[PDB]
Amino acid sequence: VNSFSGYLKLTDNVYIKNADIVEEAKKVKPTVVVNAANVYLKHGGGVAGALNKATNNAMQVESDDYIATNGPLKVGGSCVLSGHNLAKHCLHVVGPNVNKGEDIQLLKSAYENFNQHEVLLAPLLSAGIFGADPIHSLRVCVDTVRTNVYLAVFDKNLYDKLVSSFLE
Numbered sequence: 001v002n003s004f005s006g007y008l009k010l011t012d013n014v015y016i017k018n019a020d021i022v023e024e025a026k027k028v029k030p031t032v033v034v035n036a037a038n039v040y041l042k043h044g045g046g047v048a049g050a051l052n053k054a055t056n057n058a059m060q061v062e063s064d065d066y067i068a069t070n071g072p073l074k075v076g077g078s079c080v081l082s083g084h085n086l087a088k089h090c091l092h093v094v095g096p097n098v099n100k101g102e103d104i105q106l107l108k109s110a111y112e113n114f115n116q117h118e119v120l121l122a123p124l125l126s127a128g129i130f131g132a133d134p135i136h137s138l139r140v141c142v143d144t145v146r147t148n149v150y151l152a153v154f155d156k157n158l159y160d161k162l163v164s165s166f167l168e
C-alpha cells in the first residue's frame with residue numbers, strides 16, 4: 001500500500017513524476033487516487049476517462065448512482081467514492097475549466113480538498129483541456145496542499161517544463 005517510487009521531490013510534501021496516473025495506481029495501490037472530474041461525474045476523456053476505463057466502467061456506474069441521489073458537485077468541490085481496483089478510494093475533484101469561463105481562483109478550493117487525506121496520488125488540476133496555466137496550477141498545489149501529494153503528469157515535455165520552472 002502507498003509504495004510510491006521514481007518521484008522528484010519538489011517540497012517536503014509535494015512530489016512529481018512523468019507517468020500515467022492509471023499505471024501509477026496499479027503499481028502503488030494508493031489509499032486515495034484523485035480524479036480530475038467534472039460536476040456531473042461524466043468520465044468521457046482525459047484523466048477521468050482513463051481511470052474509468054481501467055475500472056471496466058464500474059466507476060461510471062457508481063458515479064451515475066451518486067449524482068442521482070446527491071446532485072452535481074460544485075466547481076472547487078469534491079466527493080469520495082470507491083477506488084475500485086485502482087485504490088481504496090477515489091477523490092473526485094472539480095477544478096475550474098477556464099476554457100468555459102470558470103474562475104481560476106477556484107483552483108485553490110479544488111486543491112484544498114486534498115488536505116482531508118494524509119497521502120494521495122493525483123493529477124495536475126485544471127491542466128489539459130481545462131485551460132489553466134500548468135505552472136500556475138503547480139504553484140497553487142505547493143502553496144495550498146499540506147498533506148503528502150504525489151503528482152503523476154502524463155507528458156514528459158510538461159514534466160520537464162514544470163520542474164525547470166520550479167527550480168528557477
Ligand SMILES: CC(C)[C@H](Nc1ncnc2c1CCN2)c1ccc2c(c1)[S@@](=O)CCO2
Nearest residue numbers: 020021036046047050127128130152154155
Ligand atoms: C496535463 C495532462 C497531461 C494531464 N493528463 C494526464 N495526467 C496523468 N495521467 C493521465 C493523464 C491522461 C491519462 N492519464 C491532465 C491533467 C488534468 C486534466 C486533464 C489532463 S483532462 O482530463 C481534463 C482536465 O484535468
